[PDB]
Amino acid sequence: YKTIGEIQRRRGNLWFRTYQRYLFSLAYQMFEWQGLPKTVDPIFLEKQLHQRGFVAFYKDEMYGYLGVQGTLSGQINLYNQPNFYTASAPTYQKSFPLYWYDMGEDLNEKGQGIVIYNNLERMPTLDILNLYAMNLAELKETIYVNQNAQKTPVIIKAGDNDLFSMKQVYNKYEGNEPVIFAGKKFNTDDIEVLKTDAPYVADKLTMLFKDQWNEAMTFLGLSQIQGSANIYLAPRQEACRLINEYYGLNVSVKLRK
Amino acid sequence: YKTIGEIQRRRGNLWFRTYQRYLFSLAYQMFEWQGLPKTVDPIFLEKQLHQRGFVAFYKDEMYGYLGVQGTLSGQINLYNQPNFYTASAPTYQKSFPLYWYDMGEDLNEKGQGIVIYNNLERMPTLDILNLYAMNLAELKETIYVNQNAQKTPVIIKAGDNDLFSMKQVYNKYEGNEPVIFAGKKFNTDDIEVLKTDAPYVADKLTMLFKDQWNEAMTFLGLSQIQGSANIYLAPRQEACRLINEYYGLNVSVKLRK
Amino acid sequence: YKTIGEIQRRRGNLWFRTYQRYLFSLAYQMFEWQGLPKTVDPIFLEKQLHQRGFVAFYKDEMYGYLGVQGTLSGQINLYNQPNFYTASAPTYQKSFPLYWYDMGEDLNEKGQGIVIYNNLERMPTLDILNLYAMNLAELKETIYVNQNAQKTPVIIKAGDNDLFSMKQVYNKYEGNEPVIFAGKKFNTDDIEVLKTDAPYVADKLTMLFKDQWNEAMTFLGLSQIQGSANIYLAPRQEACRLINEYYGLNVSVKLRK
Q1: Which residues are the signal sequence here (chains A, B, C) (predicted)?
Q2: What secondary structure letter does DSSP report for A62?
Q3: Alpha helices in A101-151 (DSSP H)
Q4: Burial B148-169 (b: 16+ CB within 10 A, else e)
Q5: Which of A131, A226, B238, C148 has the smallest C-beta neighbourhood within 10 Å, fewest atoms?
C-alpha cells in the first residue's frame, strides 16, 4: 500500500536494514547441529556466537543442559585459556569452571562447563556484514543519483522571453521541420544553451555491487578468491569433541548442504 | 543494530581490524599436528610461532611436557646454533639446554629441550599480514571515495538568483520539453556551468584487491606465481624428527588438506 | 595488535626486510644433502655458502668432521687453485692444506681438507636478492602512492566564501537536482576549478612486480627465460666426489623435489 513518495524520502536507511536483516538471517542458518538434547535451541547458540563470538555449555541440575550466555574471566591458564565462566543473563547469575583437557579420572567435581568459539580470535561475524551492507546501500543510492541525471543534460536561458509561449511550440511540434523560434513574441538575441551532461556509469556500479555481494559470501564461507569456513567450523568441532569426551553425547556439526 | 552513521565515521580502522583478525586466524590453522601428548595445546604452539617465530619444547618433571615460550641465548655453537633456552613467561623462569644432534649414548643429562622454528630466518608471519591488511583497507576506502564522486560531475553558478525557484522547476519537470529558465524571476545573464567530472576506475581497483588477496594467500603457502609452504613446513618436520629421536614419540605435521 | 598508524609511517623499510628474510630462507633450503655424518649441520653449510660463497670440509682428530668456515690463501697452484685454508672462527684458528686431485697412494699426510663452492666464480647469492627485494619494495610503495592519488583529481578555489556553508550543501545533497550554489551567502564570481588528475597505472605496476619475482626465481634456479641451477649444483657434486675419493663416504646432493 505504501505510496512511492513515502519511500523516495527514506532511501538509504531502508536498503541498509533490508540487507542487514537478510545477511544476518542468511548467516544464522549456515551450520546444522545434530545429536543435541531437545532442551537447547540451536538458533540461540548460533545467534549468540555470531553476535558476541562465544557461548557457554554448562549443564544445570534442576533445569537441564541450559545452553547459556555470559562473559569470560580474567583468571586464566598458562596457555592463555580462562578458568571460570560467569553468566550475564539478568535472571540467572550462575558461575562454573571450564574444561579444556582431561586429567585422568580424578579431574574435578564433574561440575565444569564447556565453551564454544565462533573463531579462534573471538571475532563476531556482524562486523563484516554491518560494513558490506553499508557499501551496498551507498551503491544503490549512487545508482539512482546517476540515472536521474540523464534527464537534464542541457538547459536553455531565455531571460526576457516567457515560459508558456516557449513551451507550447515544443508541445505542438510534429517533426516535419526543425524547431524554430520566430516572431516578435521572442527576442532570439539572448537565448543560449549550456551543457550539463553527466556520464553514464551505472552500468559499472552494478558489477561492483555484485563483486561486493560475492566478497561477502566468500568471507562468510558460503562460496578469483576462495573462502574457508574452517575458521568457523573447526572450533565448533573441537568443542563438540570436548563435550563428547566429558559426557557420553555424540554431537556433530556441518553446513546444511 | 548499529546505524549507518556509526560506521561511515570510522571506515578505514574497521576494515583493517576485520581483515587482520581474519588473516591471523586463517593462518593459525594452516598446520595440523598429530601424535602429540594431550598436555600441550597445538593452538598455543602455532600462535607463538607465527607471532614470535620460535617456541621451545622441554619436558618438566612435575607438570609434564609443558610446551613453553621464552627467549634465545647469546652463547652459541660453532655452527651458529644456541645452547640454552631461558623462559620469559611471568610465573615460570626455568632454563634448559638444547639438543641439536646426537652424541652417542653419553650425550647429556637427558634434561635438554628442543626448539621449533617458523622458518629458517626466525621471521614471524604477522609482518606480511599487517601489511596486506593495510593495503586492502586503503583500497576499500579509495573505492568508496571514487564511487561517491559520480554524483557531482557538474555544478551550476546562480549568483543573483534564488535556490527555491531554481530547484522547483527540476521538481515539476516531466520530460515533454527541455529545461527552460525564463521569466523576470531569473537573470539568465550570469548563469554558468563547470565540469567537475571524475573518471571511473573502481572497476580496476577491485582486480587489484583480488590480486593482493591472492598474493597474501601465495606468500602464506595456501595456494602467475607459485608459493612454497616448505618454508614453514621443513623446520617443523626437522624438529619433529629431533623429538622422535630424543624420545620415543612418533609426531608428524602437515597441512589440514 | 599493531595499529594502522604504526605501519603507515614505516612502509618501505618493512616490505624490504619482509622480502629479504623470505628470499634468504627460500634459498637456504634449495639443496638437500644426504649420507653426511651426523656431526655437520647442513643448514650451516648452505648458509655459509650463500653468504660468503665457499666453506671448508676438514676432519679434526678430537672434535670430528667439523664442517668449518674461514678464508682462502694467496699461495696458489699453477692452475689458480689455493693450497691451504686458514679458519676465521673466533675460538678456532686451525689451518690445513687442501686436496684437489689424487697423486698415487703417497699423496700427503692424509691431513688435508676439501672446499666447496657456491659457484665457479665464488659469487654469493645474496647480491641478487638484496637487489630484487629493493625493487619489489619500491614497487609496493609506488603502487600505494599511485592509488592514493585517485581521491584528489580536482580542487575548488573559494576565496571569499566560507567552508562550512559550501561543505554542508554536499552533505544535504540528495540527487533530484544538480549542485547549485546560490544566495547572498556565496559570491559565485570567483569560484574556479582545477584538474589535478593522475593516470592509473597500478594495473601495470603489478605485472612488473610479478615479472621481477619470476626473474628472481629463475636466477635462483627454482624455475620467456630459462634458469640453470647447475651453476650451484655442479661444484657441490664435484666436491662430493672429491670427498668420496679422499674418504670412503658416499655423499650426494640434489634439489628437494
Answers
A1: none
A2: S
A3: 126-147
A4: bbbbbbbbbbbbebeeeebeeb
A5: A226
Q: Could you tell me the maximum CA-CA distance found in chain B, to the nearest angstrom?
A: 110
As a whole number of angstroms, the distance between CA C30 and CA C222 comes to 8
Name the experiment that determined this structure. cryo-EM
What is the distance between the alpha carbons of residues B68 and C119, in angstroms, rounded to a whole number? 42
B4, B179, B202 ranked by CB distance to A134: nearest: B4
Name the minimum distance, in Å, from the CA of A76 to any CA of chain C: 20
Q: Is B179 exposed, middle or buried (CB count within 10 Å of its CB: 0-12, 13-18, 19+)?
A: middle
Q: Do C203 and B199 touch (CB under 8 A)?
A: no
| A neighbours by CB contacts (3+ pairs under 8 Å) | B, C
Shortest CA distance to B167 belongs to which of B176, B158, B175? B158
Q: Which residue of C has its CA nearest to B192?
A: C188
3-state secondary structure of A57: strand
| Identity of the residue numbered B178 | P
Radius of gyration of chain B (CA): 31
CB B129 within 8 A of CB B20: yes
Block residue for cell numbers 555544478: B155
Interface test with C, best of B147, B154, B155 (most C CBs within 10 A): B155
Mutate: best of C1, C3, C4, C148, partner B, most B CBs <10 A: C4
* Cβ(B86)–Cβ(B104) below 8 Å: no
Q: Find the discontinuities in chain C where C to next N exceeds 2.5 angstroms and give the residue preceding each.
A: 223
CA distance B237 to B251: 9
CA separation for the pair A198, B197 (Å, rounded): 8
**B233, B111 in Cβ contact below 8 A?**
no
Q: Touching B: which chains, 3+ CB pairs < 8 A?
A: A, C
Interface probe with B: pick from C21, C166, C168, C193, most Cβ of B within 10 Å = C21
CA distance B155 to chain C (A): 5
- At B31 the three-state DSSP class reads strand
CA dihedral C24, B239, A78, B256 (to 10 degrees): 80
**Three cell numbers at C115?**
672446499
Dist. CA B162–CA B169, nearest whole Å: 12
A157: chain B residues, CB-CB within 8 Å: 181, 188-189, 191
Give the nearest partner residue to B187 out of A159, A196, A234, using CB atoms.
A159
How far apart (Å, rounded) are the C-alpha atoms in residues C34 and C251? Answer: 6
CB A118 within 8 A of CB A232: yes
Phi-psi region of A66 (alpha: psi -120 to 50; beta: other; left: phi over 0): left
Q: What is the 3-state secondary structure (H, E, C) of B45-78?
A: HHHHHHHHCEEEECCCCCCCCCEECCCCCCCECC
Contact assignment for B144 to A121 by CB distance below 8 Å: no
Residues in chain B with CB shorter than 8 Å from the CB of C154 are: 196, 198
Question: Measured between CB atoms, which of B142, B219, B228 is closest to C147?
Answer: B142
Nearest to B123 among C2, C22, C182 (CB): C22
- Alpha helices in chain C, H assignment, sequence order: 4-8, 12-28, 42-52, 126-147, 163-169, 205-220, 230-246
Q: Where are the alpha helices (DSSP H) in C90-198?
A: 126-147, 163-169
Neighbouring CB atoms inside 10 A of C15's CB total 21
